[PDB]
Amino acid sequence: YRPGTVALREIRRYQKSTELLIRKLPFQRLVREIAQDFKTDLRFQSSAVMALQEASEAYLVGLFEDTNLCAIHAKRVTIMPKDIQLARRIRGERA
């Protein structure tokens, strides 16, 4: 189908859904690498990794929502790094 039609269909599909969208094992290796920077020989309960993953995905989706409103504000349909940077500035995540 047309790429705009495909996107919109993907939106409807991913909005009905609750599954985590990042691969479980890649996320887990990321968490382990970051933790090892702070303290070596740290282990994670598997439900600690799941908590991190649920929060990270929630965070990123919330951020994409704001990013999107920033794009639409500038009369674009396409999100760009400047949309992320604006949202994070107003959110107070960066100064």
Partner 1 sequence: RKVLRDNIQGITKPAIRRLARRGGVKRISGLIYEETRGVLKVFLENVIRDAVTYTEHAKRKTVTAMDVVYALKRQGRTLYGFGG
Partner 2 sequence: KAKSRSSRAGLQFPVGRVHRLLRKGNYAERVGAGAPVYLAAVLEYLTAEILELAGNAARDNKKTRIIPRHLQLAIRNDEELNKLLGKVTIAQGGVLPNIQAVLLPK
Task: Please say whether the dihedral angle defined by the alpha carbons of residues 46, 47, 52 and 57, taken in this order, is positive or negative.
Answer: positive
Q: Given candidates 16, 39, 75, 94, which one binds a copy of itself under the rule CB under 8 A? A: 75
CB of 68 to partner 1, least distance (A): 5
In sequence order, what are the residues at sequence separation of 6 or more whose Cβ sits closer than 8 angstroms to the Cβ of residue 77?
71
Residue ranges in 32-91 that form contacts with partner 2 under rule CB under 8 A = 50-51, 54-55, 58, 61, 65, 68-69, 72, 77
Neighbour count for residue 7 (Cβ, 10 Å): 12
Nearer to a copy of itself, 20 or 58 (CB): 58
Q: Given candidates 11, 34, 61, 69, which one binds a copy of itself under the rule CB under 8 A? A: 69
| Of 2, 14, 13, nearest in space to 64 by CA | 14
